[PDB]
Amino acid sequence: GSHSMRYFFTSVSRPGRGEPRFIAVGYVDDTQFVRFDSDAASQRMEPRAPWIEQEGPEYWDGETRKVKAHSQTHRVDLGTLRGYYNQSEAGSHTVQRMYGCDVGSDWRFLRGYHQYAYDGKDYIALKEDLRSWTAADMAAQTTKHKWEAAHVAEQLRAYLEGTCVEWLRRYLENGKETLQRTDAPKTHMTHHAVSDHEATLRCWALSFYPAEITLTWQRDGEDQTQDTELVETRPAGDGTFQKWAAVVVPSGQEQRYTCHVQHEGLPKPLTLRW
């Protein structure tokens, strides 16, 4: 199975008073491990997972100095963009930025990302090849020209194919007790009564990691999308996740309906039945 390391950055301008709010968070897979908030006393990158606290003081200074520099970059970006798009300083604006690497099943580099959004719209993205850019409009074209001339893709390749995969592998190592342990979903089925002739089966998948999951209803072997609700996958709050699907069926016919479950912590898939 493949692994990932992602840093998510957000700067929101504050036109009323002061500088922009900058929040940064770091993940290995679906597990948060670092945070920075400019609205905290700390002013340090903080840990959010037990495995990362192994890392000595030079790591933490290192990450704080960097995370603080990214804040300053994004402050300026909020300004530049404001000028590109001719906006006033009355309004509050948001810059987002995400970047990271994946390793394959083979524990080598698979993909790198490095992409930006403005006011929640795609702005400028680094492509799969890590040698070209997708600019969404003529403001991001301005950014693109700069970045071609300046050999920016080349610099982010060194990181995405090098340092980034190195540290992902280090973390997955030091944190293997949890990070390389898949929790299979604890499943069970529940049964409500919409009417005398109509009842609702529901299929629950609880306390599973990672979040990736598929729940599918089958009537008499055939997949059935009709008469089914579902919820988006949701965090349990303890680092695991929850999801359910439900189907509406004739009372008495619940033996026909089965719930299939694919989760990368399950060798064979599962089949519940009422």
Binding site: K66, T73, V95, Y116, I124, K146, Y159
Partner: peptide, 10 residues
């Protein structure tokens, strides 16, 4: 590990 490289400006 955040990118040590001076980040690019838009």
């Amino acid at each position: 590990y955040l990118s040590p490289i001076a980040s690019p400006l838009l």
